[PDB]
Design a binder for these strands. Structure first.
Ligand SMILES: C[C@H](N)C(=O)NS(=O)(=O)OC[C@H]1O[C@@H](n2cnc3c(N)ncnc32)[C@H](O)[C@@H]1O
Ligand SMILES: C[C@H](N)C(=O)NS(=O)(=O)OC[C@H]1O[C@@H](n2cnc3c(N)ncnc32)[C@H](O)[C@@H]1O
Ligand SMILES: [Mg+2]
Ligand SMILES: [Mg+2]
Ligand SMILES: [Mg+2]
Lengths: 905, 905
RNA sequence: GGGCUCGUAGCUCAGCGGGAGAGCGCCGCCUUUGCGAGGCGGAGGCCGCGGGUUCAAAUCCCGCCGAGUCCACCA
């Protein structure tokens, strides 16, 4: 089945390679060396290159990049400069995980042409899955550059297939110098990004250096072929993908112990020299143990547990090192690398415009910051993360859209935030100890999953305090991952009951027209469809163009209009003319104008937002209703009043400039070349051609209706600024007359309030404060006076209290509300009275009982309830409740005596 | 002079067939066609005889006579022009159009501007308030009247026709109409008014001056060679024909009725009679006889008052054979129905042409006519409103007005509310003044109306009532009108101190955007620099001026303020003073000119809005830019509702969004007025044959100053304040553009701060204020209630703690409390039928009170107690108050209580 | 995108259906030479907003607002 693909490869059989199989029932693979065998012990060999350059000469990062790019430039394929590490153009995935991910999936589905063919690129990529592996395996990074050649093939016409792909790999390595006998081609199944295919993964010197995937299939519901839990289907067209790890590539050029040393030596050095590490990097014994341990690092990743300690023993003896000695170096190093790597990863994340958050894309950046800070704390680093990030910056020497200054601010803020959280969380744990005297796992998940507190802090406080502990691993995911239920399975929009072809809208090129000439094709329920619509349908925000539709008979009312694919729907809550009529649709001007203005204003505010705040801001979302509009952007903190005032100002300045607005349909490639990725702030559009709107400076892919110039949108008013989530901020605004009325309404609310207190609008806050102060004062004084009433009331009531064995009993029907009854009772109880008071209320009577002695006020109230038909409760000294039947004093006294008799001896 | 020129020159005066003669008593020269009969046509020599024997071939109607006159002179070669408004918008000397000549002075009459056409013919409505007293009495005088007139302008050169030809045209019409050549008499006299004047000939037919033909060749001047009514008048280069025809007097002399009112608007006169308190019947024949005879001689008696009038009224009363005391019964109220109806007419034209009643300006004249009319209504006890009569007029005439009827109705209803309200408080003043003064004087009367708004007749009524003599001269309404009817000069500090320079140059008219210029500086006097060319802006307003600096090779010169004089620029400078004849590049601040641009254009769009929303009575009183703000004054009869405020703002902002072009250009005065109407002069009146027309949208105005190109350039408008300073004129404070945004941000800040201090969302602030308020009120009443309850309760416990003697509860205690406590409890003790004493060790002397709800005297106890503790006091039979030096034990108080009770009763 | 956690005195919190409470901070007094505090007091609160439940809501339920936190779709 699958093999039929692999054996077809030309290079393997004719040029000089063979296919073989392993002892463990794992897989097939290819070699040119007919001589030697893997032991049969799972991963028998991990590395050879360590201590031995397998390249002809040590390369540096830039050198490797250029050697690769030009080797490939000379040979017939176009160079394309890298994409950002953030998948702005995609929705399905946050960050760039592979080189192929750049062009996915419109280009890979044939929908759009690649910018060149074949092409090549050193594309940075981020994987966060291998987080456990990183710093321990010696070959993994969170952030790396993956370089590629991609050839895009259509049925009958293909630049190249498998043969040139494998060829290029073999010739590239050979030009470097590694003999064909030393390169091993492992076959494997490759899936990811909605596309997939079989892949030859090149390992040399024991290290996977490369992977070339042959994309034959795509993710699809039918899913005849199944893999990685996902469903896939054979394509009509095929694409080649080629991943080459540079960081690993330079590593095999230097033969250093770990890739980290090969890529950023100086950073690792800075960390180790300014830390709490016991040892020195220089001396022999730590050099020997690192050399040999590095050799087995590629093994230790795959094998863990009992074997891990066993292999640790094997290498410990190999170097002649105690059980405690080696991991005394291995463990701190495993953290040093992780920290060094993460800092490099932080760099690209922030620099490419990703803003830390508590959810969504930004949370990833936050996470990396968090971990970096934990590691920094554990190493007692004498520097701040910013220093390390700056080092990586100089070292790689790249240039970013986001300034390093903003990066520092973000690091400082995120750090300070974390410090706040660990503080508050810590204090909580202390309270938890005092309350429960022991820590349990079910609470432990809450500590991390809902307070962001690592178990090492919980256990590291409980043990610090002697509190009981249970630390169960492998369960952190157990609850969050395994309980989750989706509601709807089928497609997003409501599917048609019948198809209509040739639907189109000519409001794109021309927006001055509300009017148009057309014919009608279809009618369903309370909503109808036509052939050419000036009618723009409603978005998530109201985005709706009202109007009417004249018939050849009468004027019929469009109350609302939506959209289906290749269809425009017009909801009419009145009579339906049916298929017969030939019709001119006439759209209301005021709405078209207002929506135009709010669209253009949306763009203007975005433009103003980036210029005032920084390049790191990107539209997270946007929606609009009647007399209101909103725009979500990425910013690490709610702006100060100054900052938003200036934003308002600059926005209005942009209005008064009255700059021209131009929008032109175009193919995706040319647009992407022209403007950068700021084009996709409004989402990613389907189709071969896109509608490009240019508001003079800010350019974006928008299907929305727009003004001719900016002078038309009128003034712009920011209505409300709120921080949705950390790192995302919503701006509520209005423009045109929808703003002036929004202002006028605002004026009203002021005047009205002023008029109520008969005072000048300017002095409203000062008078309202004065009142509020007086209001609190008066509210208090009443509480004092009410206490006086009660105290006086008590003494009045005891004077007439019948005595009962040196106790004074009181039972009356008073004139007071429940709170007064209660305060009175509390006073009587304090003075050792016994009895109950009642008061006429509302559809009920309020009962209060009381005792200042051994007698329980609750039991007395239940007895009162039996005679008066009602229920309540309270404490030993007072009890509150309600009854339906008011009682005479005599009847109440009967009961009290009956109660008092029960309880002496 | 002007004998020889016009007694013989004209073909009519000697050739055609006519003769002059003078009468010794008359002291006048008249021009007659029948030598057989001599007559004077001005009292006391002649009374009219035409009435009852209509001298025209046919009676006419107002509409028929008007168009007939027009088409005559049209066919005779004149150009027709529509009526001018009854308010002098086009000039500054006065408020109201005195004559047809008034329409064209001083700008056409001084040859500064061309006439609309030549020759021309109009039916121009005029108000003349000097003859106000004569209205109703003479039966020929009217306050408001169409003057039919034909004009032609002749400079020292060409001419349309001359006096021979004009008197030719008038005899042409007259003879055509049925009046004989022979009877018509031409009375020689001067004619003055409105800064112009000349020798005139008054055409009289059947004892009534019907036409007036004035030839003017002079102009008012300080030389004033010729003395004309104390006014100095001197010959003008150009010469000009000015005619006058009373349309009324024509239709009057055509129908042959008794009093002009009875033939131009009989319907009004009859209806007032029908709904007044007049006792007699107009239909009745005997009264038709006496009016007919009274009307024959009404002309003379109108100009006679006192006892001389009584003799005239006797001389007529006899010739009919009716008694004087009876005759008063028709003449004194029927002249009053005449006055009200004519006034009502005058009200229609005054208000219908954009007047709004006020205590100053032409609104004063409108108010006057209304107030007097109201007074007449009460003198007739009319069952109607004035508006009924006004509407009747509007129908009768068929004229269409700028100001609609609904508005004039509202004005009138309000004015009557004012009137009754201002006589109610004005009435006491006459009660004190009449006996205080013992007699009534002219200045007293004038002071009464002009200050206290008390019409003459009320004052006279009480003066007669409380035995005080009254001297009411003839034409006193001439006094009140004349004294206030001059448009104030509003003269300001002017300084054109000698500099020997005539013609300067300003470059900012054509383009405001430019901000830099270069020129040669001539003239330095004192501080102020002056120049040949500049781009700065002067104003004596005290604002809207430009500011800046100048750099030459010498140094920098800072101009803080810039002024003007006799058309010459002024540049104040503190710092370095420049050298004459220096090349200097002038630079102004952009923003200062920018604000001013924004304000100026915003003002004009405001006036536009106010006119569109409220009415066509909306004009201006002034405009100033107090720094950091702005203000506009507008004629309106009441404070605008907040709803109206909202729609002013909304409409004007709506226009701002529209961004309509704002064009400036020069235009001929006659052409501009022909194209736009007299709204053009709302900002004032510009001189010259050409004027700087400004268009800010629909609104057209003649302000020479900076402006913005488009409405959008001034952005949102905000309305700061609204106030009434004097009746009729309402003031708006407004900001636009940047200051607008500052104001709104301030508005929002207040609202946000109030909402903040009450922990509430701003949109719910008003409702949450009234709750807090109502709570602050309720809890406030609540407090005193509780304090009263404390007192109520406290007396009740003391009755219990008391002792019994004579079955009367005696209570004597010491308590720690102030005075008002001791009183507010003693009253309740006596109210509960108790007797006793209470004491308090207050700060300083001890406080003591006594009380008795029985027949015992509270005061007496205090006498006794106070004799033992060393102090006295006082009280009543129920309670007694006292202050004393020593506190007492309870048991010692019981002694004085017991002793007392024992001694009395 | 999906869960969970928390809003109470200035701060840090406990109270989780029938009294608004503790530590620290603040104010006063007392004792103390152990200048640090100790003893006895006092001030300080719409228990975040809207509702529903009940005789009764700081307390229970639902919604909002705000502040937190983890996980989530990567040969
Ligand atoms: C291109 C294909 N879609 C693909 O992604 N194949 S791959 O996942 O195996 O990656 C190819 C090369 O990228 C590099 N690479 C992958 N994951 C890495 C990591 N976590 N750290 C450093 N390099 C990595 C390796 O050199 C690897 O051979
Ligand atoms: C034409 C010249 N400028 C002029 O105004 N002469 S005048 O003062 O006598 O008025 C001209 C005509 O207006 C009419 N008229 C003047 N005063 C009037 C009044 N108080 N009421 C009614 N008509 C009047 C007379 O018909 C008169 O002939
Ligand atoms: Mg708190
Ligand atoms: Mg409670
Ligand atoms: Mg202390």
């Amino acid at each position: 089945t699958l093999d039929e693909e692999y054996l077809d490869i030309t290079f393997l059989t004719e040029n000089g390679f063979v296919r073989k199989r392993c002892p463990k029932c794992g897989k097939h693979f290819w070699t040119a060396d007919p001589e030697r065998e893997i032991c049969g012990d799972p991963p028998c060999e991990s590395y050879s290159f360590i201590g031995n350059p397998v390249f002809k000469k040590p390369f540096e990062l830039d050198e490797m990049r250029e050697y690769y790019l030009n080797f490939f430039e000379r040979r017939g394929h176009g160079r394309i400069e890298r994409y950002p590490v953030v998948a702005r153009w995609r929705t399905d995935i946050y960050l760039t995980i592979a080189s192929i991910a750049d062009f996915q999936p419109f280009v890979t589905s044939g929908v759009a042409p690649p910018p060149a063919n074949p092409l090549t690129i050193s594309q940075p990529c981020i994987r966060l899955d291998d987080l456990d592996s990183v710093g321990r395996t010696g070959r993994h990074l969170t952030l790396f550059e993956m370089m590629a050649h991609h050839a895009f093939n259509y049925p009958g016409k293909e630049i190249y297939w498998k043969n040139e792909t494998v060829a290029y790999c073999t010739e590239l390595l050979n030009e470097l110098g590694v003999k064909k006998e030393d390169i091993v081609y492992k076959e494997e199944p490759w899936a990811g990004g909605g596309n997939a295919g079989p892949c030859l993964e090149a390992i040399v010197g024991g290290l996977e250096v490369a992977t070339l995937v042959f994309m034959n299939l795509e993710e699809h519901p039918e899913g005849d072929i199944e893999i990685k839990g996902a469903r896939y289907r054979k394509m009509d067209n095929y694409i080649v993908d080629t991943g080459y790890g540079l960081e690993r590539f330079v590593w095999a050029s230097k033969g250093t112990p770990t890739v980290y040393d090969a890529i950023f030596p100086e950073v690792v050095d800075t960390i180790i020299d300014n830390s709490n590490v016991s040892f020195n990097r220089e001396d022999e014994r730590v050099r020997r143990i690192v050399a040999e341990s590095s050799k087995l690092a590629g093994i230790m990743g795959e094998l863990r547990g009992e074997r891990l300690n066993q292999l640790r023993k094997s290498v410990a003896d190999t170097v002649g090192v105690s059980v405690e000695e080696l991991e005394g170096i291995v463990v701190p190093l495993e953290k040093v690398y992780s920290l060094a790597d993460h800092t490099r990863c932080i760099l690209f994340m922030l620099g490419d415009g990703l803003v830390p958050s508590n959810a969504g894309a930004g949370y990833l950046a936050r996470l990396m910051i968090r971990r970096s800070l934990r590691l920094a704390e554990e190493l007692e680093l004498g520097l701040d993360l910013y220093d390390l990030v700056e080092m990586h910056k100089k070292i790689l020497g790249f240039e970013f859209d986001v300034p390093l200054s903003t990066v520092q601010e973000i690091l400082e803020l995120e750090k300070e935030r974390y410090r706040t959280t660990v503080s508050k969380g810590t204090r909580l744990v202390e309270r938890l100890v005092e309350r429960k005297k022991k820590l349990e796992k079910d609470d432990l998940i809450e500590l991390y999953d809902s307070h962001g507190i690592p178990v090492e802090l919980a256990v590291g406080i409980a043990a610090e305090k002697g509190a009981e502990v249970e630390m169960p691993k492998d369960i952190y995911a157990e609850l969050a991952k395994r309980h989750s239920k989706a509601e709807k399975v089928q497609e997003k929009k409501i599917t048609l009951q019948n198809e209509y072809p040739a639907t189109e809208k000519l409001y794109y090129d021309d927006p001055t027209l509300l009017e148009f000439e057309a014919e009608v094709i279809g009618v369903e329920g309370d909503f109808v469809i036509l052939n050419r619509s000036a009618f723009y349908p409603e978005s998530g925000g109201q985005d709706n163009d009202v109007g009417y539709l004249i018939a050849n008979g009468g004027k019929f009312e469009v109350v609302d209009v939506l959209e289906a694919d290749g269809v425009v729907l017009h909801v009419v809550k009145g009579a339906k003319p049916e298929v017969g009529t030939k019709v001119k649709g006439v759209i209301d001007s005021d709405v078209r104008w207002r929506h135009m203005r709010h669209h253009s204003a949306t763009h203007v505010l975005l433009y103003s937002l980036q210029k005032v705040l920084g390049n790191h801001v990107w539209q997270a979302g946007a929606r609009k209703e009647f007399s209101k509009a909103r725009l979500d952007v990425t910013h690490f903190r709610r702006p100060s009043e100054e900052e938003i005032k200036e934003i308002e100002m600059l926005a209005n300045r942009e209005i008064l400039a009255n700059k021209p607005i131009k929008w032109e349909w175009m193919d995706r490639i040319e647009a992407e070349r022209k403007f950068g990725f700021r084009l996709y702030q409004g989402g990613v559009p389907p189709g071969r051609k896109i509608r490009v709107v240019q508001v003079g400076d800010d350019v974006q892919a928008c299907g929305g209706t727009h003004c001719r110039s900016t002078g038309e949108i009128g003034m712009l008013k920011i209505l409300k600024v709120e921080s949705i989530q950390d790192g995302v901020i919503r701006f509520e605004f209005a423009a045109g007359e929808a703003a002036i009325e929004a202002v006028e309404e605002m004026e009203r609310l002021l005047r009205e309030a002023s008029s109520i207190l008969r005072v000048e609008p300017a002095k409203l806050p000062k008078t309202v404060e004065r009142f509020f102060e007086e209001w609190k004062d008066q509210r208090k004084e009443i509480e004092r006076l009410k206490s006086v009433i009660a105290d006086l009331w008590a003494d009045i009531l005891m004077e007439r209290a019948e005595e009962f064995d040196s106790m004074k009993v009181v039972a009356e029907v008073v004139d007071a509300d429940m709170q007064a009854l209660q305060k009175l009772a509390e006073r009587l109880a304090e003075k050792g009275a016994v009895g109950c008071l009642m008061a006429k209320g509302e559809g009920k009577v309020f009962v209060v009982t009381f005792s200042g002695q051994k007698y329980d006020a609750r039991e007395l109230l239940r007895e009162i309830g039996r005679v008066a038909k009602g229920s309540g409760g309270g404490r030993k000294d007072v009890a509150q409740g309600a009854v339906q039947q008011l009682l005479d004093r005599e009847e109440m006294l009967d009961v009290i005596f009956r109660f008092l008799s029960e309880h002496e001896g």
